Amino acid sequence: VPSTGNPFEGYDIYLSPYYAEEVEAAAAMIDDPVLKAKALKVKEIPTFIWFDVVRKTPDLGRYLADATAIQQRTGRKQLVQIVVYDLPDRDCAAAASNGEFSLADGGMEKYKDYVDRLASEIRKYPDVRIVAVIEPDSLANMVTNMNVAKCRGAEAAYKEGVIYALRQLSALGVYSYVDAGHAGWLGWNANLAPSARLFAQIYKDAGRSAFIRGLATNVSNYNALSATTRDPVTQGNDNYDELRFINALAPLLRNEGWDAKFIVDQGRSGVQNIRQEWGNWCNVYGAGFGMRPTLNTPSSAIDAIVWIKPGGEADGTSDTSAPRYDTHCGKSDSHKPAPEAGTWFQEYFVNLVKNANPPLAA
């Protein structure tokens, strides 16, 4: 059964051991003592843990067991942050996708099985709280990318999969935030109303559980939360940062029947004005770690600022010959050479540390 208020309030946020391992290994490669110590600070900053392949589902059991042990030893309630990211025909508007499930090869049923595997892990550990981001780069495509044949082909599956995930996770008391793009995607004035209609419909069809807490924005992106001067890349869009986007969208959601709350990724938002084109997302060069996760947010509608994408993990390879190569990863403002998506990108992590804003302390 749901509890009232902000679901993050009063919880210690479980620190990803996956990311801590990566950061420890990264700092070991850094020669300057001060920079090494700053890098090590990063493992103390909570991130979301991604379930982007079904092989990772048993790792959820391990993290929940670990959070349970910490809670038992210390008496401090733990909250585990996860990402559900494995829809069939994933990333339908992208030049390439790493998603393992295809609609043509039983992808819808395989997706339901993936959700069931996550649910079976969660069922083992009921004493810890979970916040889940549901399916980055999915339903936002239905708002703006229906010109893409793969997106029209994926619409039914995206809606079905997201609704199945929300119903399954809400049954287990997980607090979900559905991915809702970012200011440069859904924040354009023309996209606000169809976004509000679509997300309110998903909330309805998922059964209006209060565990469906709201929407997640800026996932794996680089937008400011609130910029004093707009990024030149945002020209033409009045809603040029995430707070502007959310302030424009939230009232329309409410009119459409859902008083949604929000979380906002700021993990790679420390440096603004680093893009040639707003749609450039892959390993954007010179990004810095951004605002630290906090419940001190600029609006009652925003539950938390979070780090969803774990900075340092690559967005995609720059090898043009690689099977899953995405042309976005070869843009002039992308950091190259870059390794496979999700794998450690040392040079990129070093720049995230150097460029952190606010700066990292040793």
Side-chain angles (χ1 to χ4, degrees):
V1 302
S3 57
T4 53
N6 185 339
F8 288 84
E9 285 278 358
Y11 281 85
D12 280 3
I13 313 297
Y14 177 74
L15 295 170
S16 175
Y18 187 104
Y19 193 55
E21 283 200 340
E22 294 181 307
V23 168
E24 194 79 35
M29 291 178 66
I30 296 170
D31 292 307
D32 177 81
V34 172
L35 186 62
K36 181 185 272 154
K38 287 171 186 300
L40 288 169
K41 179 57 91 286
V42 178
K43 70 186 201 172
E44 301 167 31
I45 304 170
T47 55
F48 275 67
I49 303 169
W50 290 60
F51 295 87
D52 58 305
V53 284
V54 64
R55 68 101 170 150
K56 285 177 177 180
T57 66
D59 296 308
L60 184 53
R62 191 172 66 264
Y63 302 135
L64 296 178
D66 184 35
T68 298
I70 294 169
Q71 189 168 284
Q72 292 176 347
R73 182 178 48 83
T74 63
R76 313 205 59 175
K77 300 185 306 190
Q78 304 292 124
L79 186 160
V80 177
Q81 296 182 145
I82 73 175
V83 191
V84 179
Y85 184 46
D86 208 6
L87 279 166
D89 279 22
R90 213 178 68 190
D91 313 292
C92 61
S97 179
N98 310 124
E100 68 192 333
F101 299 140
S102 290
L103 289 172
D105 188 31
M108 194 62 255
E109 290 313 300
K110 293 171 186 305
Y111 183 75
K112 293 178 207 181
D113 182 68
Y114 154 82
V115 173
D116 294 340
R117 279 171 53 111
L118 291 171
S120 73
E121 301 296 339
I122 296 161
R123 201 178 307 119
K124 298 183 292 188
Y125 302 99
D127 295 333
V128 162
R129 176 160 291 193
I130 301 173
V131 169
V133 169
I134 310 306
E135 298 289 348
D137 189 29
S138 63
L139 294 167
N141 295 108
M142 274 70 264
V143 180
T144 74
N145 298 333
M146 293 295 276
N147 63 285
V148 181
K150 187 170 174 177
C151 294
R152 302 190 298 276
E155 180 189 24
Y158 282 14
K159 295 186 171 189
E160 184 179 332
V162 170
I163 288 159
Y164 186 80
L166 290 172
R167 286 175 168 272
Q168 284 283 322
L169 294 167
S170 299
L172 295 174
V174 173
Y175 292 85
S176 294
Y177 297 81
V178 177
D179 183 81
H182 62 92
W185 194 344
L186 302 186
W188 292 90
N189 187 76
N191 296 337
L192 294 171
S195 295
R197 191 176 310 110
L198 173 63
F199 292 108
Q201 185 192 265
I202 294 289
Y203 169 69
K204 170 190 77 83
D205 291 328
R208 300 190 170 99
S209 175
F211 286 120
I212 306 161
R213 179 70 178 173
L215 301 177
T217 81
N218 206 47
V219 177
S220 310
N221 212 290
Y222 314 83
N223 296 349
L225 175 63
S226 194
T228 61
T229 304
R230 80 193 296 177
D231 185 326
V233 87
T234 70
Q235 48 81 36
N237 186 351
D238 304 316
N239 307 318
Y240 58 68
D241 55 40
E242 293 303 292
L243 179 58
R244 282 170 173 249
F245 171 37
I246 291 166
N247 283 338
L249 181 65
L252 302 178
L253 285 160
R254 291 171 195 129
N255 294 323
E256 294 284 344
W258 186 21
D259 186 22
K261 298 292 168 181
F262 293 79
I263 61 176
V264 184
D265 197 350
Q266 287 288 285
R268 297 191 296 179
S269 289
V271 188
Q272 296 299 307
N273 312 346
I274 59 175
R275 288 173 283 191
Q276 291 298 293
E277 300 305 313
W278 206 347
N280 293 353
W281 54 262
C282 185
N283 306 316
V284 177
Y285 184 77
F289 285 124
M291 177 182 300
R292 307 304 187 265
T294 182
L295 310 186
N296 298 326
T297 74
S299 170
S300 305
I302 299 168
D303 284 335
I305 303 313
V306 289
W307 285 13
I308 305 175
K309 166 75 184 187
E313 293 177 4
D315 297 312
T317 186
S318 59
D319 179 5
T320 56
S321 296
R324 287 177 304 278
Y325 179 70
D326 191 304
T327 48
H328 280 95
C329 300
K331 297 277 186 72
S332 62
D333 51 356
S334 295
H335 196 153
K336 304 176 278 299
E340 290 287 342
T343 71
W344 198 252
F345 188 176
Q346 180 69 11
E347 295 320 305
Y348 196 91
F349 174 77
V350 166
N351 286 350
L352 286 171
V353 177
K354 291 180 171 177
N355 289 0
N357 169 32
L360 289 154

